[PDB]
Design a protein around this nucleic acid. Structure first.
Ligand SMILES: [Mn+2]
Ligand SMILES: [Mn+2]
Ligand SMILES: [Zn+2]
Ligand SMILES: [Zn+2]
Ligand SMILES: [Zn+2]
Ligand SMILES: [Zn+2]
Lengths: 162, 162
DNA sequence: TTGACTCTCTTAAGAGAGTCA
DNA sequence: TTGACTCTCTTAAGAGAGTCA
C-alpha cells in the first residue's frame, strides 16, 4: 500500500501537528531520591484536538490521513513507529509512555514494546533507582513503592509449610 | 456466612481440604543471583478437585459451602481473607499469588491487596534483589528483566525535547 | 478529505453467577 | 447437599472500525 516515502510523510505531518500541542513541564521522581523534568506535548481535553486527530475513547485517540482517495487511520501514539516491526517474540508491539501521561504525544516520551514490558514500567524504580530496562525509563514508575497490602500470608492451623 | 464462627469454620474446612492437595516443590529465583524453594499446594488439573471446589474457568476455581440451608460461594483463593476488609483506598482487595502459580492454594503463598499491587509483583526484583514490598515477595517476578523493546524514543525533525 | 462523534476489542492479573444431575 | 460444568464481568495498560455531513 503506502510507500516508504508516504509513511515518512505521515510521520512528518504527525510530528508537525503534535509539536504545536501545549508543552507542559512536569517535575518527576527519577529514583534514588532525585527529581527530574519532563516536557509533555499534551493533546487537548476536548475537540478540536489538532489536524488529523479524533478521540475514540476517554483516553484513546486516532490519527487519520487520506492518501490517493483512501482513508488511513492509526492509533494516535503508534505513528512514530510505522517503519518498525509490529511484533516481537510473538507479542504485539504497543506504544508505551515513558512519561506515564496518556495525553502526551511527545515521541521522545514513547517506546514500542510488548504490552507486558509496557505495563511493567509502572513499577520500575527509575533511571536513578535501579532501572534495568534496556530502553531506559525516563522516570520512576507511578506505582513503585512498598504497596498497601491489607493482609499477608497466614494460616489458622498447621497444614502448611512455605 | 454471617457469623465469625461460621467464617472460621469455612476457613478451617478450606485449609483442611487444601492441605491434602499435592505438594509440589518449585525452585525459584530470589534476585541477587540466589535461588530458593517454595512448596505449592496445587489444585488438581481436572475433576474431582476436592470437597467444596469447582472450576469456573481454565485457571479459575470457586469454593462453596451450604450454611443454614443456603449455598455460599467464594473465589477459591479468597477464603483465607474472609475476615479482612474487602477494599483498600477504595480499590477492591484481591487474592495475590506470591508464588505466581495460579493452581497453588497454599495460604502461605497468598496475600490480600489491590489489583495494582498484585500485578506489580510480576516485575519485582525479588527478596534478594531489592524488593521493597512491605509484605515481602517470595520470589523475583517472572517478568523482571531488561525487556525486549523494539524501538525507543525518536523524532525525525527538531520539534521535541525530552 | 475532514471532524466529531459512535461502537466494540486485547491482555493477563483478578472476579461473580446460572444450569443441570 | 455436593459435584461438574456453563456463561460473562473488572481493571488499567493498550487497540480497530462505522456513521454522517
Ligand atoms: Mn504504559
Ligand atoms: Mn498475581
Ligand atoms: Zn510525556
Ligand atoms: Zn525501567
Ligand atoms: Zn504456591
Ligand atoms: Zn517485591
Amino acid at each position: 500500500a503506502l510507500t516508504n516515502a508516504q509513511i515518512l510523510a505521515v510521520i512528518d505531518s504527525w510530528e508537525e501537528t503534535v509539536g504545536q500541542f501545549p508543552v507542559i513541564t512536569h517535575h518527576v521522581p527519577l529514583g534514588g531520591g532525585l527529581q527530574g523534568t519532563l516536557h509533555c506535548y499534551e493533546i487537548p481535553l476536548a475537540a478540536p484536538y489538532g489536524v488529523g486527530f479524533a478521540k475514540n475513547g476517554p483516553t484513546r485517540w486516532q490519527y487519520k490521513r487520506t492518501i490517493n482517495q483512501v482513508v488511513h487511520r492509526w492509533g494516535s501514539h503508534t505513528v512514530p513507529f510505522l517503519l518498525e516491526p509490529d511484533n516481537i517474540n510473538g507479542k504485539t508491539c504497543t506504544a508505551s509512555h515513558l512519561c506515564h501521561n496518556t495525553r502526551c504525544h511527545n515521541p521522545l516520551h514513547l517506546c514500542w514494546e510488548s504490552l507486558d514490558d509496557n505495563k511493567g514500567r509502572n513499577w520500575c524504580p527509575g533511571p536513578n533507582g535501579g532501572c534495568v530496562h534496556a530502553v531506559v525509563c525516563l522516570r520512576q514508575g507511578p506505582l513503585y513503592g512498598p504497596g498497601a497490602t491489607v493482609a499477608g500470608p497466614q494460616q489458622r492451623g498447621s497444614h502448611f509449610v512455605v
